Amino acid sequence: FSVLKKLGWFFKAYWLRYTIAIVLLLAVNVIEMFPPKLLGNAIDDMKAGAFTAEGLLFYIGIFFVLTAAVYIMSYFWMHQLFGGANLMEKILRTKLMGHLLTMSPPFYEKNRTGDLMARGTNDLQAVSLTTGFGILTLVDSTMFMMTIFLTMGFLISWKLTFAAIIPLPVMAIAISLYGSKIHERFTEAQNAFGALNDRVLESVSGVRVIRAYVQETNDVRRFNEMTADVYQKNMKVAFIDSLFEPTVKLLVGASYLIGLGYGAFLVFRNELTLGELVSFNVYLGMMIWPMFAIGELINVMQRGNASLDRVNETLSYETDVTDPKQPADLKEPGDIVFSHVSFTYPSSTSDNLQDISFTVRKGQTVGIAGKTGSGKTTIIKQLLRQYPPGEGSITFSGVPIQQIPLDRLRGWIGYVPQDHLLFSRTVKENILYGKQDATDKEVQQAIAEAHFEKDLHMLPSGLEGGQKQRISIARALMANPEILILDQSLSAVDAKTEAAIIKNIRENRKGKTTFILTHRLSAVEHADLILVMDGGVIAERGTHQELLANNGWYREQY
């Protein structure tokens, strides 16, 4: 029972509502303790000589009053407790999503998406159920069973009570054991059903081969056998599931007949009366429940602790990979330089970069060439602060990137990843995405200067090969980045569109730095600085002219 200790903040923040809820619960229990006694007294008074219409009216009135009170108070304390649980869900969802936003790629490399989605869909339900319903069942199983027991003991008798409550403990124990075993069998059956569901996908995705080789009969046999296995598992579950109603009926009937028989025996010995007997019966009838409440409490508490101790890990323990510091006083980036940068990915022992050194002036265009896997895009990652700084120095006009605010740095750069990351919004929002929805006019320009408004005319605005790339580059150009980075931006279109595209971008962006990563070396001709990256180093560097006066390097096309 440590979940309540680990959620102190929630109760301290919301303590008044829970105080009202618990006080109302106790008051409702006490007030609800009467009606059985009132009926016992009314019965005991009908037999006796004295009974008048005044007693009838009084009993009717008190019954109605108590009924109204319990109705209203029950409504209000359920309101408070289950509203508290809902607020807990809301708070946890906000916390989880915010933390997910504020993390970096390395965190997502260690943690799979399935676990995060589970922790955003399952653990939250368990923790909210713990804060609301586990507390409800704790109140019941602790106080309700004690008050009913001490009311029966003192109002009616103690011999009858001790004798008629013997079977209920064993009933609860048996219920708990049945619950555990049936949960185990249910897990087994669910695993079998999943194994079935895997097979159907294979037999339906690969329909062409099966029919082509007339193997459908074997697929029928396999499916029928696995269905039979699922049926056997379900029957093994039902074997244990059919033991709830017999045990409960037997062990409640035992208690009721002990009450009736031994109470009639005491009525003979004159220690009891008829009214007390019926009141005892009703008290047992309402006492049946705490038995189930105990098991509900234990299960919910264990589940909640398991979920919470896990959520705190992927919500708190992780620290942001990159950290800013005292902001520096810089407004725009002068020049980008690399002073022997050395860097290694967290999840690998390979360098991927070995003291890369070069420089870039304002308005300088830099071209990068090489073969696949030769750390072409790793350098850009070293500039977008997506990973730890590693080693070296990357100074923007004289200050390392460490001092530039993360907010400021992202403002300068314009990223176009080689992969297609287009969000499932309308095309308009996807392109305004960079500008954060400031205005509409320059969208038509942005796409015209991207020379892809023709594609827009050839598609209805909404939903959503080279279309993704053109949209991405237009989005990057929306922000007018001071350092525009393209990572194989135009691969689908070669030598016909990309040439004019790069020419227009270059002429438009005149005093702004530009980086071009591209497999084709034809598209980086005008780049006044070109580097070739092989392995973790740069084999050669120089202007396009020098390239022609060097080793033939993948120029074997034209």
Binding site: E32, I43, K47, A48, G49, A50, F51, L56, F63, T67, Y71, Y75, H79, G83, E89, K90, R93, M97, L100, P105, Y108, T113, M117, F193, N197, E202, V204, V209, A212, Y213, V214, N218, D219, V220, N224, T227, N234, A238, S242, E245, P246, K249, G253, A254, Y256, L257, A264, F268, R269, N270, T273, L274, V278, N281, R410, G411, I413, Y415, S424, A479
Partner: protein, 666 residues
């Protein structure tokens, strides 16, 4: 229609249903007789003391010696003394007062000077009366002790008896449900094997799996709910109502007046809960989708500083979901159990009104036994309400899933044919100006007419979206040509069973499918008809692949992960190995590999060379380099075979092959 089909599938296995219903009926009968035992125990023995007493002799003939005079109750009387000697035993307050005289009236009682006056508001005859201490009462109660014991035994007996039948019925019913579902499942799968290929092409593979499995599970839950909850509750309530009517008809009708309460309650709760639950589920689906699409591809979220807006949208979703959760909570807090407790206390009030009204009349008898019976019956009757309402609200999802599965089952346009092939194809194949249109009014192949000789390697090379793969579909009869005609060894394709045709041919596709399991079964497609001919993998190559670990003739199982660990080249390799193992007459190669690698394709070329031998092979590829040796190339444009001939003949005019071979290099 959903109800009809559900009833039809339930009629199968009617023996189990009948047996379960009988067992449930007996169990409920005993469980509800129990309270009659209790009521008789109370009334006929406790309150029988208040019944008249008559003086008699002392030969222990059911008589009790008060002081020196023995009396016997009227019920245990043999008419020895009936009229002259009439005794009574009243009780006022906590005291019991013996009257040794006959009486006429009965009403309120008091004692002032030992003369127990019974006023009754008409007139008061005072009779001298005594008190019975605490032991004398016992002597009037002593005889009944034996009767009660017997009654008690009955209770216990019946109790344990009843137990067995409950376990009998809940089990059978479950089995019934499960069994029905199993049958249903089989049927659907059978129908899946008889649907045309179109059905799968025009619908994602994910949805059919769901329709086959998840909807069957939903129908299983529907059956379990219906039987176990509704039938059991109906029988239980009918039994309780029978007991109540047997006890007292007047209050039986009042207790019968509750049924409209349940009806109205269920109607309203469904009306509101359906709406709120639908909103909650839709919003949760949106929240999960947003979280997924953000967690994936968050790099641009962080790069373009869009965190605030995404958080804004997420919190809008969260606010709406929280609001509807609270509304559902309000609905519950106003109906779930508070209404039950209100009705229960109102029933207590009604019992008090009815019985106390009779008591004041001075003519009716309280009959505390009937009160005990009714309180017990009403406690048992008010129990199943919450379930009934909840599953009544929930039935709709299962009704829609059943509708879906049945509309799947009731499809009419299906394929019916099957038989093993009876003769060896010989590989003669011809086309007759066929023309096929996928959907309608749009022709993908027009006037395709050609003949393929027993010489293999008859490739079809064209351009993207030119209509090459459609030839495979028409050749395997996955689609009907709708025009022209196709001949196999002079026999019409459209005059013979589909399975027979597919028995003559083989296929290799772009994405070689690696079925979960061992290699040996995968190579044989778990046919079980073939001996250890999987050794045919050797013909492809060994590559130490069997030597890496275990063996692939049912001894190694590396395919449990869809074959991702195995190389793509090895995937095509096992594909060719299977194709050769089945040893067809016509081989069709649908290869569109995006990268030769010039390292991993040597094995594919070798396998193609070794398998194409002694067959009639169609190579559906656009590389034009592995097809240099083709006996006859075919090039089609927009679905028409523009040109035909050999590579040398097709190089007499340079054209298309020239552009490709020249511009492709480097």
């Amino acid at each position: 229609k959903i109800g009809k089909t559900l009833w039809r599938y339930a009629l199968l296995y009617r023996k189990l249903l009948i047996t379960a219903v009988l067992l449930l009926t007996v169990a409920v009968g005993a469980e509800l007789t129990g309270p009659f035992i209790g009521k008789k125990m109370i009334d006929d023995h406790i309150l029988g003391i208040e019944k008249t007493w008559y003086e008699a002799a002392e030969k222990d003939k059911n008589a009790v010696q008060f002081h020196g005079v023995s009396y016997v109750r009227e019920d245990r009387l043999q008419e020895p003394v009936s009229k002259a000697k009439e005794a009574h035993i009243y009780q006022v307050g906590m005291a019991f007062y013996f009257v040794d005289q006959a009486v006429s009236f009965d009403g309120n009682r008091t004692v002032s000077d030992g003369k127990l006056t019974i006023t009754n508001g008409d007139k008061s005859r005072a009779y001298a009366a005594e008190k019975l201490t605490k032991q004398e009462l016992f002597q009037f109660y002593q005889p009944e002790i034996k009767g009660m014991v017997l009654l008690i035994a009955l209770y216990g007996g019946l109790l344990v008896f009843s137990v067995f039948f409950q376990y009998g019925q809940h089990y059978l019913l479950q089995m019934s449900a499960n069994r029905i579902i199993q049958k249903m499942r089989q049927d659907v799968f059978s129908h899946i094997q008889k649907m045309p290929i179109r059905y799968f092409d025009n619908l994602p593979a994910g949805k059919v799996v769901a329709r086959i499995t998840n909807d069957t599970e939903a129908i299983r839950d529907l059956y379990v709910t219906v039987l176990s909850t509704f039938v059991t509750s109906g029988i239980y309530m009918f039994g309780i109502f029978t007991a109540l009517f047997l006890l007292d008809v007047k209050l039986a009708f009042v207790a019968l007046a509750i049924v409209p309460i349940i009806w109205l309650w269920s109607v309203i709760y469904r009306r509101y809960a359906s709406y709120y639950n639908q909103k909650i589920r839709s919003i949760n689906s949106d929240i999960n989708a947003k979280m997924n699409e953000s967690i994936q591809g968050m790099t641009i979220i962080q790069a373009f500083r869009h965190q605030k807006e995404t958080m804004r949208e997420f919190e809008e979703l969260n606010e709406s979901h929280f609001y509807f959760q609270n509304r559902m909570l309000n609905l519950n807090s106003l109906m779930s159990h508070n209404l039950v407790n209100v009705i229960r206390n109102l029933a207590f009030v009604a019992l008090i009104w009815h019985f106390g009204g009779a008591s004041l009349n001075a003519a009716g008898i309280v009959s505390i036994g009937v009160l005990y019976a009714f309180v017990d019956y009403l406690n048992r009757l008010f129990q199943p309400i919450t379930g009934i309402v909840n599953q009544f609200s929930k039935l709709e999802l299962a009704r829609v899933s059943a509708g879906r599965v049945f509309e799947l089952l009731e499809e009419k346009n299906t394929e019916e044919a099957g038989e093993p092939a009876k003769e060896r194809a010989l590989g003669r194949v011809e086309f007759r100006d066929v023309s096929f249109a996928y959907q309608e009014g749009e022709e993908v192949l027009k006037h395709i007419s050609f003949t393929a000789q027993k010489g293999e390697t008859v490739a079809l090379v064209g351009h993207t979206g030119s209509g090459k793969s459609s030839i495979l579909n028409l050749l395997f009869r996955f689609y009907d040509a709708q025009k022209g005609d196709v001949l196999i060894d002079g026999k019409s394709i459209y005059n013979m069973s589909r399975q027979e045709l597919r028995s003559h041919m083989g296929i290799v596709l772009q994405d070689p499918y690696l079925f979960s399991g061992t290699i040996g079964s995968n190579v044989s497609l778990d046919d079980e008809r073939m001996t250890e001919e999987e050794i045919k993998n050797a013909l492809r190559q060994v590559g130490a692949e069997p030597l890496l670990k275990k063996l692939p003739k049912g001894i190694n199982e590396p395919v449990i992960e869809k074959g991702s660990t195995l190389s793509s080249g090895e995937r095509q390799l096992i594909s060719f190995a299977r194709a050769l193992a089945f040893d067809p007459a016509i081989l069709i190669l649908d290869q569109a590999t995006a990268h030769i690698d010039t390292e991993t394709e040597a094995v594919i070329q070798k396998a193609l060379d070794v398998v194409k031998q002694g067959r009639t092979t169609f190579v559906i590829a656009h590389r034009l380099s592995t097809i240099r040796n083709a006996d006859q190339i075919l090039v089609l444009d927009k679905g028409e075979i523009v040109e035909r001939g050999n590579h040398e003949e097709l190089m007499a005019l340079e054209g298309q092959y020239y552009q490709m071979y020249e511009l492709q290099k480097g």
